[PDB]
Amino acid sequence: PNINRFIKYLTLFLITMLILTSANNMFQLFIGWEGVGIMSFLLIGWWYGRTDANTAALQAILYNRIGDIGFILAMVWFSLNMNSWELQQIMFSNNNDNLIPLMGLLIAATGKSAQFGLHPWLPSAMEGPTPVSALLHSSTMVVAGIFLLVRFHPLTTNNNFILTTMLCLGALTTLFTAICALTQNDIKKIIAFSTSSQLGLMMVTLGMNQPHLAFLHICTH
Amino acid sequence: AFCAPPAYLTHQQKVLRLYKRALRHLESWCIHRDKYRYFACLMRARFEEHKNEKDMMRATQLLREAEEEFWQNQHPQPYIFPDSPGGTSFERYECYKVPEWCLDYWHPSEKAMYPDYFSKREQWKKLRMESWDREVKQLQEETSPDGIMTEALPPARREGDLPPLWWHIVTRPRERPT
Amino acid sequence: MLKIILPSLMLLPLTWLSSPKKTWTNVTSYSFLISLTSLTLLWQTDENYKNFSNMFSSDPLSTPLIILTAWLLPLMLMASQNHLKKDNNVLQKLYISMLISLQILLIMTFSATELIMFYILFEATLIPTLIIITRWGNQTERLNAGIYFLFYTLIGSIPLLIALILIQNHVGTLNLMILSFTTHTLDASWSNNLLWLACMMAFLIKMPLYGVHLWLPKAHVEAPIAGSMILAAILLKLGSYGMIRISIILDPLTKYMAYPFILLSLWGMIMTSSICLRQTDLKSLIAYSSVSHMALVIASIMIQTPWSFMGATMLMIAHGLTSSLLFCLANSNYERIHSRTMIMARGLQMVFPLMATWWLMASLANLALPPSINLMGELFITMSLFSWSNFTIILMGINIIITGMYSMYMIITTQRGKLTNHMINLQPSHTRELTLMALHMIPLILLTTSPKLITGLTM
Amino acid sequence: SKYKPAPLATLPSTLDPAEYDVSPETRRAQVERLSIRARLKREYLLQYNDPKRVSHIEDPALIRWTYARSANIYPNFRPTPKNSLLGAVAGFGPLIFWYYVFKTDRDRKERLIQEGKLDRKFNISY
Amino acid sequence: QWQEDPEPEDENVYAKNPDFHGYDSDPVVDVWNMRAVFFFGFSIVLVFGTTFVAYVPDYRMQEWARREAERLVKYREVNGLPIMESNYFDPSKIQLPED
Amino acid sequence: SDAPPLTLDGIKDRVLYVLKLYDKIDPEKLSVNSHFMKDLGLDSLDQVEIIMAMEDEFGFEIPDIDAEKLMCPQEIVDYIADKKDVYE
Amino acid sequence: DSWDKDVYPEPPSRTPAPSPQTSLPNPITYLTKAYDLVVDWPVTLVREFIERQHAKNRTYYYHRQYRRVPDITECKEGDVLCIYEAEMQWRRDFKVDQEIMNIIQERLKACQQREGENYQQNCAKELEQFTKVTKAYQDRYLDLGAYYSARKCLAKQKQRMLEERKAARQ
Amino acid sequence: QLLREHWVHILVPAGFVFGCYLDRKDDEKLTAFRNKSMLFQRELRPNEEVTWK
Amino acid sequence: EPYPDDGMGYGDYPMLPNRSQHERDPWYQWDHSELRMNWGEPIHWDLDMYIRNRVDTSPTPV
Amino acid sequence: FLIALELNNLTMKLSMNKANPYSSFSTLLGFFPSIIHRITPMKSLNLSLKTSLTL
Amino acid sequence: GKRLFVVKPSLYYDARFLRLMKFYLMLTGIPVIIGITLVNIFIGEAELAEIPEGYIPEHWEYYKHPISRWIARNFY
Numbered sequence A: 001p002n003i004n005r006f007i008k009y010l011t012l013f014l015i016t017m018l019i020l021t022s023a024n025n026m027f028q029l030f031i032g033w034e035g036v037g038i039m040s041f042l043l044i045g046w047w048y049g050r051t052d053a054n055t056a057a058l059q060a061i062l063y064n065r066i067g068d069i070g071f072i073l074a075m076v077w078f079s080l081n082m083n084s085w086e087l088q089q090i091m092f093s094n095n096n097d098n099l100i101p102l103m104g105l106l107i108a109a110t111g112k113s114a115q116f117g118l119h120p121w122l123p124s125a126m127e128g129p130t131p132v133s134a135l136l137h138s139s140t141m142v143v144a145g146i147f148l149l150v151r152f153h154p155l156t157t158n159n160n161f162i163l164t165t166m167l168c169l170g171a172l173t174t175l176f177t178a179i180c181a182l183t184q185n186d187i188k189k190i191i192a193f194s195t196s197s198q199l200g201l202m203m204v205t206l207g208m209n210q211p212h213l214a215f216l217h218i219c220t221h
Numbered sequence B: 001a002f003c004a005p006p007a008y009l010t011h012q013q014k015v016l017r018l019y020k021r022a023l024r025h026l027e028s029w030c031i032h033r034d035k036y037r038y039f040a041c042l043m044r045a046r047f048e049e050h051k052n053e054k055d056m057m058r059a060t061q062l063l064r065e066a067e068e069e070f071w072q073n074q075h076p077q078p079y080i081f082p083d084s085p086g087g088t089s090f091e092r093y094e095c096y097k098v099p100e101w102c103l104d105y106w107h108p109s110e111k112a113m114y115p116d117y118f119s120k121r122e123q124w125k126k127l128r129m130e131s132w133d134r135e136v137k138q139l140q141e142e143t144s145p146d147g148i149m150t151e152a153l154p155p156a157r158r159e160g161d162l163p164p165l166w167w168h169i170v171t172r173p174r175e176r177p178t
Numbered sequence C: 001m002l003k004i005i006l007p008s009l010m011l012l013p014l015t016w017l018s019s020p021k022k023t024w025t026n027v028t029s030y031s032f033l034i035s036l037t038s039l040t041l042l043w044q045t046d047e048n049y050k051n052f053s054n055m056f057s058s059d060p061l062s063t064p065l066i067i068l069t070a071w072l073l074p075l076m077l078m079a080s081q082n083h084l085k086k087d088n089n090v091l092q093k094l095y096i097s098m099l100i101s102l103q104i105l106l107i108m109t110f111s112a113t114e115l116i117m118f119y120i121l122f123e124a125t126l127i128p129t130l131i132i133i134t135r136w137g138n139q140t141e142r143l144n145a146g147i148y149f150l151f152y153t154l155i156g157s158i159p160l161l162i163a164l165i166l167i168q169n170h171v172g173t174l175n176l177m178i179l180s181f182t183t184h185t186l187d188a189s190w191s192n193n194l195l196w197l198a199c200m201m202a203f204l205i206k207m208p209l210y211g212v213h214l215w216l217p218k219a220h221v222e223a224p225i226a227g228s229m230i231l232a233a234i235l236l237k238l239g240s241y242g243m244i245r246i247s248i249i250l251d252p253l254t255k256y257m258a259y260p261f262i263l264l265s266l267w268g269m270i271m272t273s274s275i276c277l278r279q280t281d282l283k284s285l286i287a288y289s290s291v292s293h294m295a296l297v298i299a300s301i302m303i304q305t306p307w308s309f310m311g312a313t314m315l316m317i318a319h320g321l322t323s324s325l326l327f328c329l330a331n332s333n334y335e336r337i338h339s340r341t342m343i344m345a346r347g348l349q350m351v352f353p354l355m356a357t358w359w360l361m362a363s364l365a366n367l368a369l370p371p372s373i374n375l376m377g378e379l380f381i382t383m384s385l386f387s388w389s390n391f392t393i394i395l396m397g398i399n400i401i402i403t404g405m406y407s408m409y410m411i412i413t414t415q416r417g418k419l420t421n422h423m424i425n426l427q428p429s430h431t432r433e434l435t436l437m438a439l440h441m442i443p444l445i446l447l448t449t450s451p452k453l454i455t456g457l458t459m
Numbered sequence D: 001s002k003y004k005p006a007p008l009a010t011l012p013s014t015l016d017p018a019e020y021d022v023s024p025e026t027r028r029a030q031v032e033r034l035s036i037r038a039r040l041k042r043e044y045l046l047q048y049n050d051p052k053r054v055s056h057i058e059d060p061a062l063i064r065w066t067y068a069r070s071a072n073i074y075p076n077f078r079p080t081p082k083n084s085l086l087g088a089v090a091g092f093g094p095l096i097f098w099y100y101v102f103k104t105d106r107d108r109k110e111r112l113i114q115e116g117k118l119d120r121k122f123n124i125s126y
Numbered sequence E: 001q002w003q004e005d006p007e008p009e010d011e012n013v014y015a016k017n018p019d020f021h022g023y024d025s026d027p028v029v030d031v032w033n034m035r036a037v038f039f040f041g042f043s044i045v046l047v048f049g050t051t052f053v054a055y056v057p058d059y060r061m062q063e064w065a066r067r068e069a070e071r072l073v074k075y076r077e078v079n080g081l082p083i084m085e086s087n088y089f090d091p092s093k094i095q096l097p098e099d
Numbered sequence F: 001s002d003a004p005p006l007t008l009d010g011i012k013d014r015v016l017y018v019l020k021l022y023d024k025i026d027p028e029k030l031s032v033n034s035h036f037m038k039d040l041g042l043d044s045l046d047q048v049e050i051i052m053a054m055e056d057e058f059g060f061e062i063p064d065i066d067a068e069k070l071m072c073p074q075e076i077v078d079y080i081a082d083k084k085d086v087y088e
Numbered sequence G: 001d002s003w004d005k006d007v008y009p010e011p012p013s014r015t016p017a018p019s020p021q022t023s024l025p026n027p028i029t030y031l032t033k034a035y036d037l038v039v040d041w042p043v044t045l046v047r048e049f050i051e052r053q054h055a056k057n058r059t060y061y062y063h064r065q066y067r068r069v070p071d072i073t074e075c076k077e078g079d080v081l082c083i084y085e086a087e088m089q090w091r092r093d094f095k096v097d098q099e100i101m102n103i104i105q106e107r108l109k110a111c112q113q114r115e116g117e118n119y120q121q122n123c124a125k126e127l128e129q130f131t132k133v134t135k136a137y138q139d140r141y142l143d144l145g146a147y148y149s150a151r152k153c154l155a156k157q158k159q160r161m162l163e164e165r166k167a168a169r170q
Numbered sequence H: 001q002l003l004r005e006h007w008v009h010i011l012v013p014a015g016f017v018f019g020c021y022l023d024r025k026d027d028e029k030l031t032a033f034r035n036k037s038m039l040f041q042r043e044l045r046p047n048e049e050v051t052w053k
Numbered sequence I: 001e002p003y004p005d006d007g008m009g010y011g012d013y014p015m016l017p018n019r020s021q022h023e024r025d026p027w028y029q030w031d032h033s034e035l036r037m038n039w040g041e042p043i044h045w046d047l048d049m050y051i052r053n054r055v056d057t058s059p060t061p062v
Numbered sequence J: 001f002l003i004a005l006e007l008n009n010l011t012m013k014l015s016m017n018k019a020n021p022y023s024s025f026s027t028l029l030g031f032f033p034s035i036i037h038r039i040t041p042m043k044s045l046n047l048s049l050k051t052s053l054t055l
Numbered sequence K: 001g002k003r004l005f006v007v008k009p010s011l012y013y014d015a016r017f018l019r020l021m022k023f024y025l026m027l028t029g030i031p032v033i034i035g036i037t038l039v040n041i042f043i044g045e046a047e048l049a050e051i052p053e054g055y056i057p058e059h060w061e062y063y064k065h066p067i068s069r070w071i072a073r074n075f076y
């Protein structure tokens, strides 16, 4: 009976996702980021009479909120040291030890792309309907952290520590989520852990100095 | 879900519950139908060969070690039916099960949209209002002076009245009100 | 300023001379018009502050508070209309008189250019809130709540009076602009430290710290809906406004004297958000959320950064609007069920769809959502605090996580889930209370659209 | 090859030893608990599908839970050295810890700025 | 015990006035209060006030400061002056204490 | 579109179908009012297996207490009807 | 185009001429031609009508230059009139310097986007101007509080001049 | 008194008019430095009494 | 069985056996079906922790 | 593909294997949801109540 | 056939509130939006000019939009 509300929610998620993708400054990036999170909460808790669905939506909010903490740390550092929040001045700050912003962006990407440590919301969060599972947690929403890192790749290339820990984190989460996907019975759970494994593979590709291959795998996946 | 549990489960009930749970977990392990039938026949043979004991303590010890074995080698992710607790689509349509007293709060325009239904609903409300007093009188007359009272309810004893406390389960929402 | 004060003063004869069948209509309509009149001092073309009179003055800081007060008076009338329907006409007119006097005194307090007049109107506002809470509260504990509120405020405010008379005897004027221009540095003595404490602790009581804050949940639980509205949306901001005003004459020693209150604010916002997590009462949850947001405001004003002041003003206005909205929604459920227990009404999204929409928007405003002045204020407070010390980001992050958790916990446990079908007395909705939610939420959208108004003194 | 429970992931009713070594006293206790449950269920059902009911059901158990959680704690609080120590540490230890954290950080920052080893690269608005 | 009125039940307000708007018991005062709240609260203060705030010009000298900054930057660029001199006040009109 | 509704006759036919394919009983002796132990000669394990087969046939789980209450194909049919809200 | 290249510099675009070595038609060129003929022409006509109406009802607005009042340095302390005028002109200059900083930041962002991959090389003068204006802003307005004032700015400048004079002794 | 009855609707508008009058009276009360500030201090124009009323 | 007078203000409130609501019988229909608790039953002190939206204490296979 | 096809034919084979901790670890998601989602909410909520509110 | 009555809450009061709110908001804003569009199309948008010959402009003569100039002339 709420098919119109369902379609409107999907449209709102698409609008927020395209805002997040095409945003030029980190504030608009954050608008798209958190709008994607909120529409994810609603679409996971679509059947609001289901307690398990409500728990899944709440824990997705929790893990994405820890990612938001990392995002806010990066945003605040960039505001304090480059008074624009815009990617052009972010480019102009490419060689001044961006360890704190890159660590914050890595935490944000871990939260959104469900790497190890902040992973289980992605497999838990498809007790909602299957088109929600598909569009949200298989093609667009979970890409967002990897998209953030490929957006900040020119800063990323000058920090070897961030590249190494991205490679290690991505390898760990792709191995662990493939292991979890091996002995699973729910089809949605199998494809969710497969999605997490491919996101870990994109994180590995970002651990190398190849962001463009990671974005190619984003579209392909 | 329709019968209230007693004070305790008898030994026969506990054995039957263990048998059903063991067969379900056995199916979850051996997915394939022929393999499941083979091992289910083996499990039935084990229950049959421990069936006749004539010693309550020995039977209880057998049941205890069988439950120990079940918890030792149960399936960590067993098969759960949909519309069953723990499975997918368990409480899915609770968001659509509207509890039917909101029709009292419906506007006269909305009631005018469905005239025959609301005439039948008014007839049902009149029947409930007329039957409530005899329901209460029968429940008071039910012989429960002190002590052992179970959660069961009596039927309509005399001719012409209704079973007590019938409304909340006769007029419950449909399992898929879509 | 008189063109705003005098119509609000004439609201009282209108209230007492209107017919009993036209009192609410007349007072609500004319208070809406008074808010529209109070919109006229946003005409700030020059950087000069609008000094209308020798005793009344305007400000980019005072103006949003005045407009919020004048906007909130008709909202309080609408909210308090239903729970006074079985009441004497004299009592109804007296309640409306209390609300109108609160609006008049708060407008005069925010527009006052003298600290001693600010103090006088501060306690003048202390009176009718006490009368409202005690006379029209529901439970027994309203008398204890009134005692706690009144004497927390008074024990705070007496050293403020001593400090103000000390400053007047020292510099001769006690006028805000003269003090701002010929402010004098303090020679960092123990007497000056006690002077700083005396002039700060009144406002640190009025907007809650982690210490003295115990009056706020009691008063908010025991107060009626208009009392909760006026408290949580104006009076804490009145304390913050006083701190911003009086901090200018304490230049050299705030930078070390503000240390314990910054720590108190940060750890207290964490602890009060935790209480919101394990809180069984909806009004208590909203009250402790107010404590957390005002702790953020305290920390920003103490660190005294232009980003901190701007974020403090934005969080002041945003929190006033969203806390009043949350209180009104909770009051709608309480008027349905006559109990404030949170776990008791659960599946309300089924029967109240657009009220659930207002709940969802109010909670998305309660947590920091980036297209909102709530996130604007919280984010710039975070930026200023991280500039103050880089390690504050840990406390900020913990607070943000727990804030999202209690807001979404509120939504899930009071709107979603299986409906408690035994609650027959769930009337569909009042157009009045849906209008009340809309009149809370639409100004949030408009101020998000143009946040230059809510930016305070510093930029 | 044995299940070890804990406060989280407790012991099943199919594994606890009390289920198998039953006594007539425990059977009588179970029957009495069933009787209490049945009486409360009957009272609730009468109050629930009474047609003359125009309001909700008040739930005195929930009222007692709320009152015990809210307005009973200070009347039934007794100061002991244990809770005095707990209150002192929980109300002061975090404050002193974050005091020393922020104080050391700000003193280091101020010293670096005064000695010129810290440069604000493009920090114009703070 | 004392001679007290019992707790009154709360009536279904829609049982007698199905077009109830939340304001008053009798329908005429109720509908006129609804109309007064909507007209004075949405029509003339959420629209006219929004328009007035929108057409307040040069709010705290923002557009003036834009034009003045453009003029000063253009002047200092075409005249070769150091744009944004480091010292605000002229050093010749400031007297420093000796030694 | 999908999921055709089930009626009392279909429920009775499917229950009788499964019981006729039990192969332990019913040599053209089964009726709809035949008790599993009184005049079909079964026991509790057989009744549990019959309930399991009915659950696998209809795709939903009968809870244990109601399941052990069920003892005849007529009341199995009545239980499916009460759970699925048949004869709307 | 109210903006001028003196305050918002933009190098002249150098686009290369097409060399269609393939035989396939260009859908971009076809869509741009159709887009012009369908969208751009009616929009241009509407804007020309609107501009004709504006030229009929043409009116003017001015700039309001302020003249220099006596500053905080040349009048006595405790005189609230001179202090008020100096404070107002200092706040005016502060807002003007904020927008000067905004102009330089816009210029830097435009340089970075225009040059793209060569921003580390040919944006040298934009980055140099940004660094110099940042240094001057930090010298005049940085450490002032949320109650920043002409008196506080003067005190900061006098302290900085004292430190520079003391360093110039040795 | 031709309309009568609901006469109370002029109370708040009367208060608003009186408040505007009191603001005008305060503007007439201050009146110092009419053109004596260092910022504006312009000539009085061939046809103009005061700069602002 | 009340709390052992261990400081904080537990009065005569009972010590319920400290198990989450996930471990209640889910087939049995409860008066508070989301809470899995009947009307008039004593509420656990930590019902907020032990609701099905929150901390689970159900037995695990490992 | 070949290894998994061989293992699936081994599942076709009619014999019960002994359950291994590697398989239990994989099917219970590495125990990360159970362990973390039971120890972090319990400690956080219990600390929040039993200190922040009631102490 | 076999259409069943789905039980729904009373959405009439919700729809009535939304209809009334949109009605009043439209009832004033649509004339205001039309007036804004007509003013911007036909008049206004003052063009920046230099100060001529020592002329002293009016204060509203420093503002751009015609509605801003009208309010500044008639009220401030």
Ligand SMILES: CCCCCCCCCCCCCCCCCC(=O)OC[C@H](COP(=O)([O-])OCC[N+](C)(C)C)OC(=O)CCCCCCCCCCCCCCCCC
Binding pocket: C152, C155, C156, C157, C158, C159, C162, C163, C166, C191, C192, C194, C195, C197, C198, C201, C205
């Ligand atoms: C609600 C909060 C309550 C606690 C915090 C209250 C402030 C704590 C710190 C300030 C001291 C106490 C208040 C003094 C008010 C006047 C301050 C002032 O003018 O200082 C400058 C003056 C000094 O004057 P001076 O600065 O002109 O000194 C001359 C200096 N030379 C010569 C250099 C020019 O301080 C005092 O005179 C302080 C005397 C205080 C005597 C009374 C103390 C009463 C008990 C203290 C607590 C009272 C509140 C709590 C009561 C209990 C509540 C449960």
Ligand SMILES: CCCCCCCCCCCCCCCCCC(=O)OC[C@H](COP(=O)(O)OCCN)OC(=O)CCCCCCCCCCCCCCCCC
Binding pocket: A052, A055, A058, A059, A062, A063, A066, A116, A117, A118, A168, A169, A172, C277, C398, C401, C402, C405, I053, I054, I055, I056, J033, J034, J036, J037, J040, J041, J044, J045
């Ligand atoms: C090689 C490199 C390796 C690097 C490794 C790095 C690891 C970093 C890990 C950081 C995060 C750890 C903590 C995560 C906690 C998440 C808790 C959660 O979401 O629990 C969900 C759970 C319900 O879910 P569940 O029970 O599974 O589902 C039932 C359905 N059958 O329960 C609930 O929903 C309960 C409701 C919430 C209760 C309140 C929770 C408040 C939490 C406040 C936390 C504050 C501190 C945060 C610190 C973050 C640090 C990054």
Ligand SMILES: CCCCCCCCCCCCCCCCCC(=O)OC[C@H](COP(=O)(O)OCCN)OC(=O)CCCCCCCCCCCCCCCCC
Binding pocket: C039, C042, C063, C064, C065, C067, C068, C071, C317, C361, C364, C365, C369, C371, C372, C443, C445, C446, C447, C448, C449, C450, C452, C453, C454, E045, E046, E049, E050, E051, E053, E054
């Ligand atoms: C000041 C103190 C206030 C205290 C509380 C007061 C409460 C009572 C308020 C009474 C009325 C006062 C209204 C105040 C806000 C006015 C908004 C407004 O019109 O702003 C002007 C703005 C255009 O002005 P402009 O100068 O361009 O803006 C700055 C650009 N440099 O205009 C616009 O941009 C047009 C705005 C209206 C058009 C509709 C906008 C729709 C926006 C949809 C947003 C959707 C997403 C929302 C997400 C929310 C998430 C929580």
Ligand SMILES: CCCCCCCCCCCCCCCCCC(=O)OC[C@H](COP(=O)(O)OCCN)OC(=O)CCCCCCCCCCCCCCCCC
Binding pocket: C003, C033, C036, C037, C039, C040, E044, E048, E049, E052, H012, H013, H016, H020, K074, K075, K076
């Ligand atoms: C039907 C209900 C009402 C519908 C109203 C519809 C239009 C709403 C327009 C809203 C415009 C934006 C809101 C803010 C306007 C503020 C105007 C104001 O007070 O300006 C101050 C000014 C002071 O006078 P001043 O201009 O100094 O006089 C010397 C000449 N330069 O004052 C003036 O110049 C004179 C005052 C002009 C505005 C009067 C507003 C009065 C509102 C309160 C009384 C309403 C009574 C009911 C309606 C009566 C209708 C006849």
